[PDB]
Design a protein around this nucleic acid. Structure first.
Lengths: 213, 39, 820, 793, 125
RNA sequence: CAGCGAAGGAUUUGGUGGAUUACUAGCUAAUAGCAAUCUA
């Protein structure tokens, strides 16, 4: 048929480079394990806000996303998960610890549910983000709520927030750690099991909006 | 003219009835080009 | 066959062909007139500049040419032409059918020897005119008196005599009395050349064995003899600046210099010209000067100079050898490949079978220069191979020049005969480059190309594999393997985005270039021999083996034209620079032009030599063809750059044949139509008072139209004349007692704008009427004739709001669609 | 797309040389620097010849058949051009400075004054093919001792009368047999003889000199031997004669002096018909019409060109250009005229078709740096070095607004709002950006944050975000409107000159001093892609400098870039003599144009002959908003490069059955839509015009509704470039109405495809059709008044 | 005597000098190989100038990086910047400009902070 | 050392010739003469 030759000598270097590292020059995988192609966002209106189309090697892109309004809609969603994981007074700044426990939770997500953990966390985002909410229409403070819709950036924000703080309180004083509780949370949120803090909170917010619609 | 022609890079060049008024604007056949407010 | 697109202009790159040239002397300067086939060319001997080229090609080859002061005498098939400044002044028809093949000019006499050993003398009419013109007598050298006439000369101070040098004898004729004065003794070997010495009544004879005789034409003896064993002598010249040297010229290409005073041999210039092309054909000293001009049959004309002697007291015995001075030259073999170097049609690259790449100038023949083959240094520092005895590269199959990055790096990429790598060249430096691109499959290079970014060169091997190298750094970038038989054409888009290859298995492959994919593959019905990509219109043409030319576009990958008509193998073809025509040339001795819009053959030329190369200029100026015989490049100019040619097919809606459409005057009688004229005439008419402040036949035709009730001639005169005339005719219209001329003008304008033509002018004529003397119409308002004339004018004019709401719709909807 | 050819040369109506008229004196031929411009003064249009001398041209003549021109430059390199085909026939080098060239009245000979030799050559045919040597020399006469200043042929092309710097004038017969009729020489002048003319009957000879004497020579007796019968003097004291001409039929002697004053006399009686002044600079050229009614004067110092009718004392045109001093240009929002901001302090509004200046504006007291249009051609803003931005109404021609700062700085670039509330301007000595309201006059803001001189400003045309870019290697994006005060700085590799902005406001292309054009996404401030342009730049070698053109760092970067209106291309120019255009998806050079081959300019030759001058530079480039062209403000003038569809066969998916023959068979068989799409696939202008006119009015909307969407911009841009000059106004408006009604939603959702084809259509509706509709409306209302009211006494 | 090239990579206070020259293909950071650059979770931040363009660009050149200052993540960002713009500058000066701006296009499409840092800050609102 | 490597290789330099603008010939007292000479 037709084939292109574009290297003309088997490439060998003087510094020995590991075989999986030099295998990573044909496709960029997260932590050299998890592929970014065939990772779709199975809910439209959240594609163009959960970003999985520039593959990365680690969740530590030091780029600047907090100086325009919707610029954090194209931080990769693994890194948005990581950044939302490193928040409380105890664990502020510790992005390498957050990256390391994201690596551990994607390994154990894959070893429990034998599928792509990036696809699992993307399904967890698109199942967790609430599609309706209530504002408090004031009237000076008349305690009545009015149901509003909710924009997709707010849905991705509140999805990552619900998932991460659900993993924190689920790891609060049990035997499991943050990596294992976050793995359980992301798996249950991906399949949508109503056993997770995150989609129970989504179902409560959507049900209250349905109530005082 | 002479101080800014030597303070520059690129080159700068320099009775009968009428001097023909070679330079003159306003003309696409305009006569009353004043504003209605001006009038 | 005469053509109707291209007309012959010149045949460039030619300097000599081995007819012995003539020298001539205007004042104290010298010119050198050399024959190039059927034209001669005059050169300025102080700098070898081309002064003149003869104006018309002679009907056969020029075979003997001489030059007195202003005039050049060129003898071809039967007749002698007398030329001044190229333009022919006279033509002397001889009364024979024998071919004239020698001539001399002295006095009032021109003497021309034919090849049946007859001599024709021609005389001036009155000794003040410029050239010999009338027939005088005929002389004959019969077999008793001498052999074949081998030269015809007049050695000086011989009152109307002629030295005729036959192959064995030397005769001396008196050309007024027609007599044979003196016939010498015989010579034991056949003499080939003669030259008169600057010594009085001495001629010098050169034989077919190796000896120069110095015959004394008054004593009848020979003065001395010079022996050059096993060398046929083809030239003789004498030095005339106080140094008695002789220069003999030998048909193995040697120029030997003798001192006659002290009988020694000064120097030998060996291999001054090629023996295979004739050796040194004419060598002559410019007289009084130490410079000698040689010329050979290898299309070359050189000058050699004697420097003054290096010993400050002896001099005459220490003779410094002759050194080289200026020279002009071209190809010694017919060229094999042709390209244009730039878009200006100034230089053209040209490769020949004598293994040289020349760069010939179309503007000034002094600028023609041989691209040098002196190799660079190796990049790492290792040794380069090759023979020590340096020879030229194998003769060039193909080349591709793309001067986008010219002067920056290597610029020409060329492919040679039966060798597996393609060299590069630099046109700016005019030299070879540092890189030779290999094919990497042990196959010869069948095609080359290069992109118009100038970064990439493409090699197409005979084992079907395209390799893409970088022209700057010389290394393999990519390698496509689609074909299995030889790849004969590679080209690429003007945006470096899609490449197109064609092999002689008859598949055209279409590849994306940035991505390394293929976009498609199209199987034709013959092996493809040559591709030409027209790059602006993205249409490439293939010369198939079934003697058709398939024109196919690269965007949608379809065969879009197929041109039939050639009877043998298509040697070459090329697109017009506008991409409208394609000119092909093939081994049925023909050149055709195809209008690929209509798909037919516009013009055909039957040319006697087969045209092996055809190239258009990158502007529409010139066609350059290259034939099987002839060392030069034939140059044609397209007459369709100055006129327009009909795209109507030859063998063996005139506006659509001349590609025009004269727009018809009005499309429909119910359609408004402006004037055929400038748009500004309405504004000039409406505001010519303020414009200038910022700066009768009519009455007779109006009356006659009021009689006949048809104002067509009136309105024709109105649309004809100028705005000052229009204002001055409308302003004087008898607005006083019965008001006839006003109402005749008004219903003339009514008859006018009933016809829906020139209607903006009829509108301004009504505006000029109301402006000039609408006050009298307002004065005798309710007058019956003028009120009825205005009534029917409004009756026709009220149907003009079609234009109003039409432009209202177009303006409103165009604004809405553009903004929102 | 990329197949631009040199169309026109706006600006610079005259540089150096002699003006010529046509025979039917409708066009005048004017030597601009090394081109030749031809202005048709009745059919209001103009073109410039494509060919190019290598030095400034000094002589022009075309024969009175109008069929071929010959132009000689200031060292004798003649060029013979076919005047109708507009293609050059021959290049002939006369060896020295030729003062005049003239064709005979019978066209068949021309003569020229090369040095002190009068040489007559005979004219090659226009019908003959090009030869290697088409000129055949008639003779060369040498009787003058110094250089010949003028020629004059007689009425019959039989004698020629030449004037020299040597203080004589001579008469030579053309042929040898009349040598005895013409062998005299005419002495008596104190200075250079500037002209020598015959009378109508060729009995009197008038010889005008530089000091101011005109001598009348007659063949009288005091035998008969050419006495001098009367000397008349101009008595202009300080000034002296610079150019003379004579119309022998109307007996009109026209004389221009070195003081701008020209006088015109009725010659054998020497009565001053008129005396008036061009200006203060000398009158370098006088030329006269064949009927003698128009006089064209050229002054060479200010580059000005009058043609003036002396009967009706009035100037047909007054047109002064700008050599070498042109800082900016801007197309009008329909591509009908170009506004030029020039270094002598003035704005000039040049029509493009007719190559002349409509209005000029001198209220800046220093070099105007930038012009920019706004409010859809109603207002025009300019900023200069005298410290002012100011606004110009192009209706009432008034400077109605002037904006200054508070710091006394000089402004180098500006940018206006789309919704023209705010003007904005940046300097090269202040590091701030000055933000003025246009409605009130006040200084609305001073934006600060650059640490280097703000080289360029541009407002995004759609979302109205400001982009500035400065020599601190930084492009910066300011959200000004609506409570933001937001600043986004994008750093870049080197210092920026000429930012430019996409028509949709999505991206911004900056030119840097490295030599590159980088293209950035505005909203997500990351680089989309760059072009590396410093190796396809032609940087010539100056005469004064001692470093090669390869190693020079003078001009290997672009100081002005501009987007195409479909957003897909960038034209670019700088201080070099190449202008380059690229397509920004592929980042590849489409085409590079050599802006000058004049060796009289400086940076033209890369290699100087081994045997200050005005350097060549382009200061502003812009694309045309309506028709597929660009203007470049070089030193020679406003170079206008445009494609045309008459040439270049470039089809669009034709097959073997798609043919002009097939198209006219489909037209004769009246499948009108099939004929229209066959002509679109041919993409042949005559075929599209033929089918377009052959479709009837009854079924314009069926065809226009069934046109496929890929052929929509072709039919729209065809209708635009056709309907500007075509007479079929209702036919073209019917087609426009049918296309806008049938497919005017596709246009609105594909704005930038039809962004130059729709601007060309409303260049037809408001500029010819609305003028006609205005005239018929005024006629209707004057009728209704003149018949509806009471005129009694 | 050798064709060599020096570039600089900076983040907050780390700074890395990279010398690139022709050689056998060895990439050495602070004397040790590139496969030892701790904190070992950002070793692919260091690797991505190699894996973005292929190791066949590095098969003929040897790089050495000297990194001072900063912290762990500032040093890996300085290393990757120095490696990236050193490869670009080597292919500019000693290989062809087409591979030069192909490398610039690949690095700029990944992130232009491999080639241009974010340097002077803050903003005074 | 390996490698490159055809009766040698590298570096430096002086001189000359040709291009560095697009080729209609020299001289003079120039409608022609001269160019061997303008002068009786």
């Amino acid at each position: 048929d037709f084939e292109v030759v574009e290297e003309f000598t088997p490439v060998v270097l003087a510094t020995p480079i590991p075989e999986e590292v030099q295998q990573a020059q044909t496709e960029i995988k997260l932590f050299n394990k998890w592929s970014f192609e065939e990772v779709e966002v199975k809910d439209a209106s959240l594609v163009d806000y959960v970003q999985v189309r520039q593959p990365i090697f680690v969740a530590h892109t030091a780029g600047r996303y907090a100086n325009k309004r919707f610029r954090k809609a194209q931080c990769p969603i693994i890194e948005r998960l990581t950044n939302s994981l490193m928040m409380n007074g105890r664990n502020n700044g510790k992005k390498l610890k957050a990256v390391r426990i994201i690596k551990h939770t994607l390994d154990i997500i894959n070893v429990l549910t034998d599928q792509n953990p990036i696809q699992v966390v993307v399904d967890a985002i698109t199942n967790t983000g609430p599609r309706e909410d209530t504002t408090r229409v004031g009237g000076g403070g008349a305690a009545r709520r009015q149901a509003v819709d909710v924009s997709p950036l707010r849905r991705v924000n509140q999805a990552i927030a619900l998932l991460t703080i659900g993993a924190r309180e689920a790891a609060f004083r049990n035997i499991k750690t943050i990596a294992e509780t976050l793995a359980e949370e992301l798996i249950n949120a991906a399949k949508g099991s109503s056993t997770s803090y995150a989609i129970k909170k989504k179902d409560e917010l959507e049900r209250v909006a349905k109530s005082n619609r | 003219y002479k101080l800014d022609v030597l303070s520059s890079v690129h080159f700068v060049p320099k009775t009968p009835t009428i001097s023909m008024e070679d330079a003159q604007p306003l003309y696409m056949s305009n006569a009353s080009s004043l504003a209605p407010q001006e009038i | 066959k005469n053509s109707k697109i291209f007309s012959p202009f010149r045949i460039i790159g030619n300097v000599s062909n081995g007819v012995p040239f003539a020298t001539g002397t205007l004042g104290s300067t010298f010119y050198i007139v050399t024959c190039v086939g059927k034209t001669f060319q005059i050169y300025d001997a102080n700098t070898l500049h081309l002064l003149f080229v003869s104006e018309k090609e002679t009907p056969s080859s020029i075979v003997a040419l001489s030059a007195h002061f202003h005039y050049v005498y060129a003898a071809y098939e039967n007749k002698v032409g007398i030329y001044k400044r190229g333009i022919e002044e006279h033509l002397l028809e001889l009364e024979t059918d024998a071919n004239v093949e020698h001539l001399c000019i002295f006095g009032d006499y021109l003497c021309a020897s034919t090849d049946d050993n007859s001599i024709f003398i021609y005389k001036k009419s009155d000794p003040q005119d410029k050239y010999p013109s009338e027939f005088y007598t005929k002389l004959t050298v019969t077999e008793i008196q001498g052999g074949e006439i081998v030269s015809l000369q007049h050695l000086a101070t011989y009152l109307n005599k002629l030295t005729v040098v036959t192959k064995s004898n030397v005769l001396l004729f008196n050309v007024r009395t027609g007599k044979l004065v003196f016939t010498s003794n015989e010579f034991p070997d056949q003499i080939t050349t003669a030259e008169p010495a600057p010594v009085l009544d001495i001629i010098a004879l050169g034989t077919v064995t190796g000896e120069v005789i110095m015959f004394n034409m008054r004593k009848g003896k020979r003065i001395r003899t010079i022996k050059i064993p096993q060398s046929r002598i083809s030239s003789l010249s004498f030095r005339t600046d106080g140094s008695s040297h002789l220069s003999v010229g030998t048909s193995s290409g040697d120029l030997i210099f003798y001192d006659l005073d002290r009988r020694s041999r000064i120097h030998v210039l060996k291999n001054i010209h090629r023996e295979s092309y004739g050796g040194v054909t004419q060598a002559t000293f410019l007289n009084g000067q130490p410079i000698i001009v040689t010329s050979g049959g290898d299309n070359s004309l050189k000058e050699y100079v004697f420097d003054p002697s290096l010993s400050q007291g002896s001099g005459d015995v220490v003779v410094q050898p002759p050194r080289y001075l200026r020279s002009r030259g071209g190809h010694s073999q017919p060229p094999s490949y042709i390209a244009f170097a730039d878009s200006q049609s100034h230089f053209m690259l040209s490769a020949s079978k004598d293994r040289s790449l020349w760069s010939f100038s179309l503007r000034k023949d002094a600028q023609s220069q041989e691209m040098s083959q002196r190799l660079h240094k190796k990049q790492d520092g290792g040794r380069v191979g090759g023979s020590t005895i340096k020879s030229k590269f194998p003769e060039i199959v193909a080349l591709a020049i793309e001067n986008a990055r010219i002067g920056e790096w290597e610029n020409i990429i060329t492919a040679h005969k039966d060798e597996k790598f393609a060299r590069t060249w630099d046109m700016r430096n005019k030299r070879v480059g540092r890189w030779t691109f290999d094919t990497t499959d042990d196959g010869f290079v069948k095609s080359v190309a290069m992109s118009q970014c100038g970064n990439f060169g493409f090699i197409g091997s005979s084992n079907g594999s395209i390799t893409i190298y970088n022209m700057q750094s010389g290394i393999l970038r990519k390698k496509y393997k689609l074909h299995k038989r030889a790849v004969t054409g590679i080209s690429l888009d003007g945006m470096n985005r899609k490449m197109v290859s064609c092999g002689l298995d008859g598949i055209v492959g279409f590849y994306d270039f940035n991505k390394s994919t293929l976009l498609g593959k199209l199987k034709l019905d013959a092996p493809i021999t040559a591709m030409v990509y027209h790059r602006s219109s993205d249409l490439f043409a293939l010369a198939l083996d079934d003697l058709s030319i398939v024109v196919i576009d690269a965007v949608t990958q379809r065969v879009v034209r197929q041109l039939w008509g050639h009877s043998n193998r298509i040697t070459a073809f090329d697109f017009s620079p506008e991409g409208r025509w394609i000119v092909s040339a093939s081994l049925d001795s023909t050149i055709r032009t195809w209008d690929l819009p209509t798909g037919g053959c516009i013009d055909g030329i039957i040319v006697d030599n087969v045209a092996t190369n055809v190239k258009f200029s990158p502007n529409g100026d010139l066609l350059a063809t290259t034939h099987v015989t002839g060392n030069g490049i034939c140059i044609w100019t397209n007459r369709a750059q100055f006129k327009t040619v009909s795209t109507r097919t030859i063998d063996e809606l005139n506006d659509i044949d001349f590609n025009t459409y004269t727009s018809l005057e009005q499309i429909d009688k119910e359609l408004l139509t402006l004037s055929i004229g400038p748009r500004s005439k309405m504004n000039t008419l409406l505001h010519l008072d303020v414009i200038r402040k910022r700066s009768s036949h009519f009455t007779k035709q109006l009356r006659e139209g009021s009689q006949s009730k048809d104002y067509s001639s009136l309105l024709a005169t109105l649309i004809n004349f100028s705005p000052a005339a229009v204002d001055l005719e409308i302003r004087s219209l008898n607005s006083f007692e019965p008001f006839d001329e006003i109402v005749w003008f008004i219903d003339a304008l009514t008859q006018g704008l009933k016809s829906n033509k020139n209607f903006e002018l009829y509108e301004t004529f009504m505006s000029l009427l109301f402006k000039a003397h609408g006050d009298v119409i307002h004065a005798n308002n309710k007058n019956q004739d003028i009120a009825s004339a205005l009534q029917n004018w409004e009756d026709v004019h009220k149907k003009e709001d079609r234009l109003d709401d039409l432009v209202k719709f177009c303006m409103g909807v165009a604004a809405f669609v553009t903004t929102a | 797309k990329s197949d631009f050819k040199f169309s026109n040369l706006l600006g610079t109506v005259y540089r150096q040389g002699n003006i010529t008229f046509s025979d039917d004196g409708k066009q005048l031929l004017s030597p601009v620097g090394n081109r030749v411009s031809v202005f048709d003064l009745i059919n209001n249009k103009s073109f410039t010849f494509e060919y190019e001398h290598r030095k400034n041209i000094a002589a022009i003549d075309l024969n009175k058949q109008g069929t071929l021109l010959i132009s000689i430059d200031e060292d004798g390199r003649a060029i013979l051009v076919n005047f109708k085909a507009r293609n050059v026939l021959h290049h002939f080098n006369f060896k020295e400075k030729c003062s005049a060239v003239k064709f005979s009245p019978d066209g068949r000979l021309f003569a020229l004054a090369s040095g002190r030799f009068l040489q007559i050559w005979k004219t090659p045919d226009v019908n003959k093919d090009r030869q290697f040597a088409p000129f055949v020399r008639h003779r060369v006469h040498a009787g003058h001792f110094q250089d010949i200043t003028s020629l004059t042929w007689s009425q019959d092309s039989r004698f020629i009368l030449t004037t020299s710097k040597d203080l004589s004038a001579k008469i030579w017969s053309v042929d040898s047999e009349e040598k005895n009729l013409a062998a005299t020489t005419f002495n008596g002048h104190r200075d250079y003889v500037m002209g020598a003319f015959f009378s109508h009957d060729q009995e009197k000879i008038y010889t005008v000199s530089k000091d101011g004497a005109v001598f009348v020579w007659e063949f009288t007796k005091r035998k008969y031997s050419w006495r001098i019968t009367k000397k008349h003097f101009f008595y202009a004291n300080q000034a002296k004669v610079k150019c003379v001409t004579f119309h022998p039929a109307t007996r009109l002697l026209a004389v221009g002096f070195t003081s701008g004053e020209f006088r015109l006399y009725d010659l054998p009686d020497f009565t001053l018909i008129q005396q008036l002044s061009m200006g203060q600079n000398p009158v370098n050229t006088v030329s006269v019409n064949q009927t003698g009614e128009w006089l064209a004067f050229g002054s060479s110092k200010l580059g000005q060109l009058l043609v003036y009718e002396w009967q009706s004392e009035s100037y047909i045109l007054k047109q002064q250009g700008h050599f070498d001093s042109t800082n900016s240009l801007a197309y009008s929002p329909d591509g009908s005229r170009v506004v030029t901001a020039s270094e002598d302090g003035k704005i000039k509004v040049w029509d493009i078709t007719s190559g002349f200046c409509l209005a000029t504006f001198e209220e800046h007291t220093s070099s105007v740096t930038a012009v920019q249009f706004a409010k859809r051609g109603q207002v025009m803003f300019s900023s200069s070095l005298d410290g002012t931005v100011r606004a110009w109404d192009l209706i009432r021609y008034r400077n109605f607004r002037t904006f200054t700062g508070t710091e006394r700085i000089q402004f180098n670039c500006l940018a206006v709002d789309p919704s023209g509330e705010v003007v904005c301007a940046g300097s090269l000595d202040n590091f701030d950006i000055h933000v003025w309201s246009v409605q009130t006059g006040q200084l609305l803001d001073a934006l600060s944050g650059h640490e280097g001189p703000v080289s360029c400003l541009s407002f995004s045309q759609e979302n109205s975000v400001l982009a500035s870019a400065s020599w601190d290697k930084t492009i910066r994006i300011w959200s000004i409107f609506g409570r933001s005060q937001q600043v986004e700085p994008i750093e870049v590799y080197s210092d920026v000159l000429a930012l430019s902005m996409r028509p949709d406001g999505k991206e911004v292309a900056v030119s840097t001093l490295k030599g590159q054009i980088s293209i950035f996404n505005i909203e997500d401030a990351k680089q989309v892609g760059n072009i590396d342009c410093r190796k396809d730049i032609i940087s010539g070698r100056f005469n004064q400098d001692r470093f090669t053109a390869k190693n020079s760092e003078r001009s290997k970067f672009f100081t002005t870039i501009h987007y195409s209106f479909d957003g897909m291309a960038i034209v670019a120019g700088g201080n070099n003599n190449s202008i380059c255009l690229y397509d920004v998806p592929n980042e590849v050079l489409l085409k590079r144009f050599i802006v000058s081959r004049n060796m009289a300019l400086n940076g033209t030759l890369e290699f100087l002959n081994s045997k200050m001058r005005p350097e060549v530079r382009v200061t502003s480039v812009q694309f045309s908003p309506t028709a597929n062209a660009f203007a470049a403000a070089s030193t020679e003038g406003l170079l206008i490069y445009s494609t045309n569809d008459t040439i270049l066969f470039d089809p669009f998916d034709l097959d073997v059955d798609v043919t002009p023959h097939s198209t006219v068979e489909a037209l004769r068989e009246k499948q009108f839509l099939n004929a229209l799409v066959m002509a679109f696939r041919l993409n042949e202008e005559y075929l599209i015009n033929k089918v377009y006119e052959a479709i009837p009015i009854k079924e314009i909307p069926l065809v226009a509704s069934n046109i496929p969407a890929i052929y929509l911009p072709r039919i729209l841009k065809f209708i635009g470039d056709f309907a500007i000059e075509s007479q079929h106004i209702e036919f073209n408006l019917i087609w426009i109405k049918a296309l806008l009604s049938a497919s005017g939603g596709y246009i609105n959702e594909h704005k930038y495809l039809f962004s130059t084809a729709m601007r060309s259509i409303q260049r037809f509706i408001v500029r010819v059709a609305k003028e006609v509709v205005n005239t018929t409306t005024d006629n209707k209302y004057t009728y209704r008044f003149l018949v509806s009211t009471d005129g009694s006494m | 005597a050798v064709p060599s090239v020096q570039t600089f990579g900076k983040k907050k206070s780390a700074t890395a000098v990279a010398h690139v020259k022709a050689g056998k293909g060895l990439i050495k950071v602070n004397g040790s190989p590139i496969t030892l650059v701790e904190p070992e979770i950002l070793r692919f931040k260091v690797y991505e100038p190699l894996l973005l363009v292929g190791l066949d660009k590095f098969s003929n050149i040897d790089i050495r990086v000297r990194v001072t200052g900063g912290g762990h993540v500032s040093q890996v960002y300085a290393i990757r910047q120095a490696i990236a713009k050193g490869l670009v500058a080597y292919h500019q000066k000693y290989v062809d400009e087409q591979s030069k701006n192909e490398l610039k296009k690949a690095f700029t499409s990944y992130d232009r902070t491999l080639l241009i840092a974010d340097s002077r800050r803050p903003e005074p609102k």
